[PDB]
């Protein structure tokens, strides 16, 4: 009963079920947690990963009504350190190696799920089928 | 300081920015509350309103991680009456009259606001930016 600190990252582009169920099992690694988000940047995003709909204040503000979110870093860094872990006091990353080997290393990374199908751009397609034909 | 029951009900179809905004509105309206959501059936919705992208079980387990939210009537009865309030003890109902004329006649009544542009529909819009053109 220790209060334990986890940090997950990522865009959270169009926030859908999917990000919320795996904010969800983050938050729930053990009984008394402090779930740290971080948030990462449009140019980073940009640049080493993909196109973003959201803005980083679009998608920051969003992650503040989510239930489990405690805190929210915003921007985070790009790539996680050692030393970004002292400075925030961090127990134990949350992510679905060999980026992440040191982390495992240390003991300090926890695996989630992805919930597949349940997307932003999934439900487009539903409303499609009402056209759909010939 | 007294616990102040707030009860708010819609379709939540494709939860945004937009609804979240509401209900943290709802959950705000006094020190001390419930906040109480209703979510409405997928017949009663499409029969009275419009159609709707996802299903009764989909808007609802979404709601369930949504911080403001306290309690979920999934599904909601469509019209709300005197009787309703009395068996869930609903101090309030918030909405953003004809059909409310009753509610504020009571004094149960609590104005909340929209917030236009935030909905999913608008952020289609932005990824075709991308290549509007000729
Ligand atoms: N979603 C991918 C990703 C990339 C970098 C980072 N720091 N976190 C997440
Ligand atoms: N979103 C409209 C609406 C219609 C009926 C009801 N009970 N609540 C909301």
């Known amino acids: 009963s220790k209060n334990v600190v986890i940090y997950a ?13 795996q904010l969800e099992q983050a938050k729930k690694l053990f009984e008394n947690t402090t779930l740290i988000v971080g948030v990462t ?13 959201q803005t980083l204040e679009e998608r920051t503000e969003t992650l503040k009504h989510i239930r489990w979110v405690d805190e929210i870093i915003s921007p985070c860094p ?18 679905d190696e060999d980026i992440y080997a040191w982390l495992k290393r240390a003991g300090k990374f926890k695996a989630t799920q992805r919930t597949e199908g349940v997307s932003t751009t999934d439900l487009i397609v539903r409303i499609l089928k009402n056209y759909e034909d010939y």
């Open 78 to 95: 790009w790539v996680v350190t050692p030393e970004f872990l002292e400075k925030y006091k961090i127990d134990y990353v949350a992510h």
């Open 9 to 21: 990252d990522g865009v959270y582009d169009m926030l859908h079920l999917g990000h919320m169920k």
């Open 41 to 53: 940047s449009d140019n980073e995003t940009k640049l080493f990963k993909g196109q973003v709909v």
